[PDB]
Write a protein that binds this ligand. Structure first.
Ligand SMILES: *[C@@H]1O[C@H](CO)[C@@H](O[C@@H]2O[C@H](CO)[C@@H](O)[C@H](O)[C@H]2NC(C)=O)[C@H](O)[C@H]1NC(C)=O
Length: 50
């Protein structure tokens, strides 16, 4: 699903940022997309079940 668009300090169209959320692999931190502390966009919060 879409995410609620946070503000980025890079120039992005926030009307379309909802569809560019990171891919949801296994239920780790950042849904297995990264092992960093924070990603460039927030992961959707339903990644434990989806
Ligand atoms: C743009 O990025 C963040 C917000 O997305 C700005 O704020 C910093 O965010 C980091 C992330 O944890 C904090 O640790 C800092 O305390 C924040 N404040 C700072 C660095 O003053 C960040 O400032 C912005 N960067 C720009 C405008 O270059």
């Amino acid at each position: 699903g879409n995410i609620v668009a946070a503000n980025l300090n890079e120039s992005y169209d926030i009307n379309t940022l909802r569809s560019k959320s990171p891919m949801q692999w296994d239920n780790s931190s950042n849904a297995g997309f990264s092992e960093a502390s924070n990603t460039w966009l927030p992961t959707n919060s339903d990644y434990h079940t989806v």
